[PDB]
Design a protein around this nucleic acid. Structure first.
Ligand SMILES: [Mg+2]
Ligand SMILES: [Mg+2]
Ligand SMILES: [Mg+2]
Ligand SMILES: [Mg+2]
Ligand SMILES: [Mg+2]
Ligand SMILES: [Mg+2]
Ligand SMILES: [Mg+2]
Ligand SMILES: [Mg+2]
Ligand SMILES: [Mg+2]
Ligand SMILES: [Mg+2]
Ligand SMILES: [Mg+2]
Ligand SMILES: [Mg+2]
Ligand SMILES: [Mg+2]
Ligand SMILES: [Mg+2]
Ligand SMILES: [Mg+2]
Lengths: 106, 191, 172, 136, 197, 193
RNA sequence: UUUGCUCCACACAAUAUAGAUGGAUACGAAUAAGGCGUCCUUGUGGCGUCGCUGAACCAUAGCAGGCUAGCAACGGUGCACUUGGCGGAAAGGCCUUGGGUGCUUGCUGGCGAAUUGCAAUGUCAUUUUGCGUGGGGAUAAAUCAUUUGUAUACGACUUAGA
C-alpha cells in the first residue's frame, strides 16, 4: 500500500560515554515506542541498519548501509546499546536508524 | 498543620441576589450592582439556601485559612454596600488659613479642588472615583461627604483627599492642618 | 535508618562460677535487621546495667509482628533526642496501622522537623491509645470526627509521553 | 433572580468510596475505603476483586464516582457482604470508564488477521456513512 | 513521531520547557515554539524583574559590544534559557539549534497547524497552587520589549478567525456524529464493536 | 588610586560613534504624534541652507529687563521652493516593527527625480520607471489595487516628495527625494490626499 | 568579449544532503474548574453526558502494488482546468462553483507473479548547478578615467559630463 516498512524507527543518540570520555565502539539507540528496559528486551539481537547516500556509485547503487545489532538495554527509559561492523560516524548523532524484526523469536 | 476543612457563612438579605461562577462574584441589590474577582484565592463557594452561602478551604495551611475570613468580609461589604450603602464624612482642620474645597471639571472630570492649604498658592486636585458622589455637607462647618456602593472606592477616594493635604517641612504635631476622615457609616438611616 | 522490624532481644551477663544463671534482661528494639538490633540492645544495655557485649551473651532474638495489622490505631509516642545545643524529651502522636509503620514516620518526622538523624534519637515508649479523647495533639484528633469526608482538589495526572494534544484538567 | 452559586462537586474520600487501584500487584482492580488514616493514607479492602485488605497511599489509587453504605472499619467478611448487596460491580461495569478500559484490552488482544478484518469493515462502514453525509 | 512539533508556550514554565526542547533537538526533532509572550516563570514579577536587571549590568568594560548581549523579547529570553542547555559552540550544537524556531504570537503557517503542550513543563500541573509566578510578556515589556500591544492586537484578531473555524468544524462533526449513529446497530457496526472498534 | 581632583568628563557619550554619517541627508527618526481629527498635511519639509543675517525686533516678555525694548538677534535662512509629490508608501505594524507594504508612484516623474536614480546620467538610456508608467495606460487596475491595498492595511502613510533643485542657485541638478509622514486624519483620507 | 538574459516545459549530466519511508490531525478560556449534546427566559441559565490521556483519530489489501470484466451505488478521491470569495504577523495559503478525466478494496469475476535460488537498504526522497534544444517574455547599468568641493591622510563621500 502506502506503507512498505518492515522495521522500527530509531535514533542514533550518543556513543557510550563518561562525562569527559566516549567509546566509539558502542552506540546508544533510542527505539520508537520503547519506554522501559523491559519493553527493550524484545529487541536485543535484532539487526540494525544505518542507511545513507553517496556520490560514487559503487556496486551499482548510490546508497550504502552500515550494519549492526542491538546488544543490551541501557538505563531505565528504554534506550538500547548496539554495536556495528564499523563504528558509526558521529555526525549521525540524531540521525535515523532502522531496527528490523529479525532474527525473529515470535 | 493543614486543617482539613474550615468554612464561613455569608448571610444574604431579602433584597439581593449574589451569583458566582469561577470565583467571579456578582452581588446585585436595591442600590446597584457590584462585582469582584476572587480568582487569586482558591476557596470553594457553596449555595445552601437563597439567604445563605458558604465558603470553605480544604486541606489548608495557616496563611490559607487566614484568607477565608477576609473573603467572607469582602463579599459581605459587597452585600451591605449594595443595600445600605457607604458614607464617609471628613472635616477640614486648619488653625489660620481656611481650606477652600470645590469641585471642578476638565474634559469630563469631576476633580476635588483644594485651595489655600496652609496658605499655599498651589492648587491641589484629587479625582472623583467613578461610583462615588461628593456632597459638601450643608449645615455643618467644613464637612465633606463621600458616599457610594463600594467601600473600597469610597474609603480610597477619601484617603486620596486626606493625603494630598500632608504637611511638609513643619512639626506636624503643631501644624495639624488637613482634611481628615471624621466618621465612617452607612447611607440609609436607622441602620 | 531503613524499613523497620520490631525485635525482642534478650541477654544476660556470662555465667560465673559463683553467679550461674544471671538475671536475663529484655528490650524491644526497632531495627531493619537482627545485626543492628543486637547492636542497639548492647547500646542501651550498657547505658543501664554493668555489662558490655564482651562480658554478656545474647540469649534470644525474636521478631514481633503486629497483632492486628489491618486495624487503624492512634499511637502515642515518647522520645528523647539531641539537638545541636541540647538534649530534649518529646511526646508526639502518630496514627497508622502498625507500630512498625509508626516508628518509620516518627524517624522521618524527627529528621524533617527537628533535623535529628537516627543516631540522635531514643524511642522511649510506643503505646496504643485505647480511648479517644485521651488523644492529645490535634493533627490527629482532626481525623477522629464522625462521618468524616474530604475531597482532593486540583489533581495532577502523571503523563507518560512528553507531548500532549489536549491541555489538562485538574478536576476530580 | 435566584442566587446561583456553581457546583464544583468532587469525589470524596469517605468510608465506602470505591477506588480503582492504578499500580501494583492489584492494579486495575476495584476496592473500597474502609477507615481513613490521614490526608494521604487510607485503609482499603478489595475482597471481590481479590485485593488484600491493606493500608495504601491515596496517590496509588484513583477515586471513582461510585459509593455504597459501609460501616467505618468494617471487616473483610462484612465488606464483601455489603459490596454484593450494593451491586457495585454491575454498576462499575456499566460505566463508560470501565467500558473504555475493556475496549482497549480487546484491541490489544487482536490477532494480525483480526486487524486485517477490522480494516475491511471500516472500509465498508465508511462507504455508507460518507454516503449519508452527502444526502443531508 | 512528527516531522515538526509546534508547542504553544502559554502556561509553560521557562526552564522546564527549555529543558525538554533542548533534548528533543539533540535527538533530531524539529521544534517551533509559539506564544512565547504567554510563557511563565516561577516567583513573583518583582523577583524576576530584579533578576533581569542583575543580568543587565554585565557588560564588557572596555567595549559594551563584545560584552554579553541582552535580548528583551519573550522568544529571545526563552532562546537564552534553551541555548544554555545546548553545547552551542560545537557543530553538533549549532546543528541542533537550527532545528528550532521561537515566536511571540502565532504567525502564519503555524496558526493553521495544530499545536501541542508539554505536561512536565505545564505550570498548572507543576506549580503548587498558591505559589506566585510571572508572565514573560509583562517581564519583557518592563525591560524594554516594544511589541506587546501589536502582538496582543494581532492575536485578538487571529483568535476571532480561529473561533469561526472551530464553530464550522464543531457543526460538521455534528453531522458526522448523526450519520455515524444511523449506521449504528447495523451488521458491520456490531462486528466492529466485537473487535474493539 | 583616585583622581585627586574631580572634574566632569569631556564630551557626550550619547553622540558616539563619532564617524562620518552614512549620507548627506540626515534621516528623520521620529514624526509628530498623529492627531487624526485635523486636516491632512505634511509633517516636514525639505530645503537648502542659504546663510544667516541679523534682525531687530521688540521683545514681549513681561518681567524681563528687556520687556518692550528692542533686541538684535541672529537668524538663518533656508531656501524652500515648493516640494513635489511623486508617491505614497503604506506601512503596517508587525511584532518585528514597522514594515513597508507597498509604494505607489506618480505616472510622470521629473528628470530632477529621475536623475537621483542614476550614478551616470549622460551615458544612460534613462529607462527608469518607463515600465511602471505603463500601468496607468491600462484602465489603472494595478495602481488602484495597490492604492486599495494601502487603505485596507497600513497603520501609517507617507508621501514621497522631492525638491525642485532647478529653482535653486545650486549647480547640482540632482534632486532630493524623501518620505514625509501624513498626520492629517483617517488612513483612507490620507492616501486619497 | 563570439548569441547573451529571464520565466514555463524535458532532456542529459553532474553535485550534493545534521538524515522522507502512511498523516505536523488549527477554538478560546478556566484549572477550588471545564468540553460536548439538548432545551429555553439567551443567563455567572435548566437538564443530560464525558474525562481517569494520542493505547486516539484518519489512512491502510492490489508487480513499490501489473493487465483486465461486471455489479451496486450518485458516494469518495487524484489531476489539470473553470466560478465566486477569503487571508498582509512572515498573507504566497484556505474556501467555494461547474463540467472533463483517472482510480476506487462498497461487492463479485478472469489473467499474471517462480530461477532475485534460505538474509545482504536491495535503490522509489530533494539540494544546488552545468550543457545543448523551443514555447512565451524583456532589450540595462556600474566601474576606471575626467570633473565639483557641501568631502577627503590614501581609499571613501558629494557633483558634473553625447
Ligand atoms: Mg577528567
Ligand atoms: Mg520632619
Ligand atoms: Mg523647621
Ligand atoms: Mg493497539
Ligand atoms: Mg553603575
Ligand atoms: Mg574622588
Ligand atoms: Mg506587494
Ligand atoms: Mg549536512
Ligand atoms: Mg455548547
Ligand atoms: Mg448550563
Ligand atoms: Mg482524538
Ligand atoms: Mg489499484
Ligand atoms: Mg481482483
Ligand atoms: Mg515562518
Ligand atoms: Mg535558450
Amino acid at each position: 500500500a502506502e506503507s512498505h516498512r518492515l522495521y522500527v524507527k530509531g535514533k542514533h543518540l550518543s556513543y557510550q560515554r563518561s562525562k569527559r570520555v566516549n567509546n566509539p565502539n558502542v552506540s546508544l539507540i533510542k527505539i520508537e515506542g520503547v519506554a522501559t528496559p523491559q519493553d527493550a528486551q524484545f529487541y536485543l539481537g535484532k539487526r540494525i541498519a544505518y542507511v545513507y547516500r553517496a556520490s560514487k556509485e559503487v556496486r551499482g547503487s548510490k546508497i550504502r548501509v552500515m550494519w549492526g545489532k542491538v546488544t543490551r538495554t541501557h538505563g531505565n527509559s528504554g534506550v538500547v546499546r548496539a554495536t556495528f561492523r564499523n563504528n558509526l560516524p558521529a555526525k549521525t548523532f540524531g540521525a535515523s536508524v532502522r531496527i528490523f524484526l529479525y532474527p525473529s523469536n515470535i | 498543620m493543614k486543617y482539613i476543612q474550615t468554612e464561613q457563612q455569608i448571610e444574604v438579605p431579602e433584597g439581593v441576589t449574589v451569583s458566582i461562577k469561577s470565583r467571579i462574584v456578582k452581588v446585585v441589590g436595591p442600590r446597584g450592582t457590584l462585582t469582584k474577582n476572587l480568582k487569586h484565592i482558591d476557596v470553594t463557594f457553596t449555595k445552601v439556601n437563597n439567604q445563605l452561602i458558604k465558603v470553605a478551604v480544604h486541606n489548608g495551611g495557616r496563611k490559607h485559612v487566614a484568607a477565608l475570613r477576609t473573603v467572607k468580609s469582602l463579599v459581605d461589604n459587597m452585600i451591605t454596600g449594595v443595600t445600605k450603602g457607604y458614607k464617609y464624612k471628613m472635616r477640614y482642620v486648619y488653625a489660620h488659613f481656611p481650606i477652600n474645597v470645590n469641585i471642578v471639571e476638565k474634559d469630563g472630570a469631576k476633580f476635588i479642588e483644594v485651595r489655600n492649604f496652609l496658605g499655599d498658592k498651589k492648587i491641589r486636585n484629587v479625582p472623583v472615583r467613578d461610583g462615588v458622589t461628593i456632597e459638601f455637607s450643608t449645615n455643618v462647618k467644613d464637612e465633606i461627604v463621600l458616599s457610594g456602593n463600594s467601600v473600597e472606592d469610597v474609603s480610597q477616594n477619601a484617603a486620596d483627599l486626606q493625603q494630598i493635604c500632608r504637611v511638609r517641612n513643619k512639626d506636624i504635631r503643631k501644624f495639624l492642618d488637613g482634611i481628615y476622615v471624621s466618621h465612617k457609616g452607612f447611607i440609609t438611616e436607622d441602620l | 535508618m531503613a524499613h523497620f522490624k520490631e525485635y525482642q532481644v534478650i541477654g544476660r551477663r556470662l555465667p560465673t562460677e559463683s553467679v550461674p544463671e544471671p538475671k536475663l534482661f529484655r528490650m524491644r528494639i526497632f531495627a531493619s535487621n537482627e545485626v543492628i538490633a543486637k547492636s542497639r540492645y548492647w547500646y542501651f544495655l550498657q547505658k543501664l546495667h554493668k555489662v558490655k557485649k564482651a562480658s554478656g551473651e545474647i540469649v534470644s532474638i525474636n521478631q514481633i509482628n503486629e497483632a492486628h495489622p489491618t486495624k487503624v490505631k492512634n499511637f502515642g509516642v515518647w522520645v528523647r533526642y539531641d539537638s545541636r545545643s541540647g538534649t530534649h524529651n518529646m511526646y508526639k502522636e502518630i496514627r497508622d496501622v502498625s507500630r512498625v509503620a509508626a516508628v518509620e514516620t516518627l524517624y522521618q518526622d524527627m529528621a524533617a522537623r527537628h533535623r535529628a538523624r537516627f543516631r540522635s534519637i531514643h524511642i522511649l515508649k510506643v503505646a496504643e491509645i485505647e480511648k479517644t479523647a485521651d488523644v492529645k495533639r490535634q493533627y490527629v484528633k482532626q481525623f477522629l470526627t464522625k462521618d468524616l469526608k474530604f475531597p482532593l482538589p486540583h489533581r495532577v495526572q502523571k503523563s507518560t509521553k512528553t507531548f500532549s494534544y489536549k491541555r489538562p484538567s485538574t478536576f476530580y | 433572580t435566584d442566587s446561583i452559586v456553581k457546583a464544583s462537586n468532587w469525589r470524596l474520600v469517605e468510608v465506602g468510596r470505591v477506588v480503582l487501584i492504578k499500580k501494583g500487584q492489584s492494579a486495575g482492580k476495584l476496592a473500597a475505603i474502609v477507615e481513613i488514616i490521614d490526608q494521604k493514607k487510607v485503609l482499603i479492602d478489595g475482597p471481590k476483586a481479590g485485593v488484600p485488605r491493606q493500608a495504601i497511599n491515596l496517590g496509588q489509587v484513583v477515586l471513582t464516582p461510585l459509593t455504597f453504605a459501609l460501616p467505618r472499619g468494617a471487616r473483610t467478611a462484612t465488606v464483601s457482604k455489603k459490596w454484593a448487596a450494593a451491586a457495585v460491580c454491575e454498576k462499575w461495569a456499566a460505566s463508560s470508564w470501565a467500558k473504555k478500559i475493556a475496549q482497549r484490552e480487546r484491541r490489544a488482544a487482536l490477532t494480525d488477521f483480526e486487524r486485517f478484518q477490522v480494516m475491511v469493515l471500516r472500509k465498508q462502514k465508511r462507504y455508507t456513512v460518507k454516503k449519508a453525509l452527502a444526502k443531508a | 513521531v512528527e516531522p515538526v512539533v509546534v508547542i504553544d508556550g502559554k502556561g509553560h514554565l521557562v526552564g522546564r520547557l527549555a529543558s525538554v526542547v533542548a533534548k528533543q533537538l539533540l535527538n533530531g526533532q524539529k521544534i517551533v515554539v509559539v506564544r512565547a509572550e504567554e510563557l511563565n516563570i516561577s516567583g513573583e514579577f518583582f523577583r524576576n524583574k530584579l533578576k533581569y536587571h542583575d543580568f543587565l549590568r554585565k557588560a564588557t568594560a572596555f567595549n559594551k559590544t563584545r560584552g554579553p548581549f541582552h535580548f528583551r523579547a519573550p522568544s529571545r529570553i526563552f532562546y537564552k534559557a534553551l541555548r544554555g542547555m545546548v553545547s552551542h559552540k560545537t557543530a553538533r550544537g549549532k546543528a541542533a539549534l537550527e532545528r528550532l524556531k521561537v515566536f511571540e504570537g502565532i504567525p502564519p503557517p503555524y496558526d493553521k497547524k495544530k499545536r501541542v503542550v508539554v505536561p512536565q513543563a505545564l505550570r498548572v500541573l507543576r506549580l503548587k497552587p498558591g505559589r506566585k509566578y510571572t508572565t514573560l510578556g509583562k517581564l519583557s515589556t518592563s525591560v524594554g520589549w516594544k511589541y506587546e500591544d501589536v502582538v496582543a492586537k494581532l492575536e485578538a484578531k487571529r483568535k476571532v478567525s480561529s473561533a469561526e473555524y472551530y464553530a464550522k468544524k464543531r457543526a460538521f462533526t455534528k453531522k458526522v456524529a448523526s450519520a455515524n449513529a444511523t449506521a449504528a446497530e447495523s451488521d458491520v457496526a456490531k462486528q466492529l464493536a466485537a473487535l474493539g472498534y | 588610586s583616585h583622581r585627586k581632583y574631580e572634574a566632569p568628563r569631556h564630551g557626550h557619550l550619547g553622540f558616539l560613534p563619532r564617524k562620518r554619517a552614512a549620507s548627506i541627508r540626515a534621516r528623520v527618526k521620529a514624526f509628530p504624534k498623529d492627531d487624526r481629527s485635523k486636516p491632512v498635511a505634511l509633517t516636514s519639509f525639505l530645503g537648502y541652507k542659504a546663510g544667516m543675517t541679523t534682525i531687530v525686533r521688540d521683545l514681549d516678555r513681561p518681567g524681563s529687563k528687556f520687556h518692550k525694548r528692542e533686541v538684535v538677534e541672529a537668524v538663518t535662512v533656508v531656501d524652500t521652493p515648493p516640494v513635489v509629490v511623486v508617491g505614497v508608501v503604506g506601512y503596517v505594524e508587525t511584532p518585528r516593527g514597522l514594515r513597508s507594504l507597498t509604494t505607489v508612484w506618480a505616472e510622470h516623474l521629473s528628470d530632477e527625480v529621475k536623475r537621483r536614480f542614476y550614478k551616470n546620467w549622460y551615458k544612460s538610456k534613462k529607462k527608469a520607471f518607463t515600465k511602471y508608467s505603463a500601468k496607468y495606460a491600462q484602465d489603472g487596475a494595478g495602481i488602484e489595487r495597490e492604492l486599495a491595498r494601502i487603505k485596507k492595511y497600513a497603520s501609517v502613510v507617507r508621501v514621497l516628495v522631492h525638491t525642485q533643485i532647478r529653482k535653486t542657485p545650486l549647480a547640482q541638478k540632482k534632486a532630493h527625494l524623501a518620505e514625509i509622514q501624513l498626520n492629517g486624519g483617517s488612513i483612507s483620507e490620507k492616501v486619497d490626499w
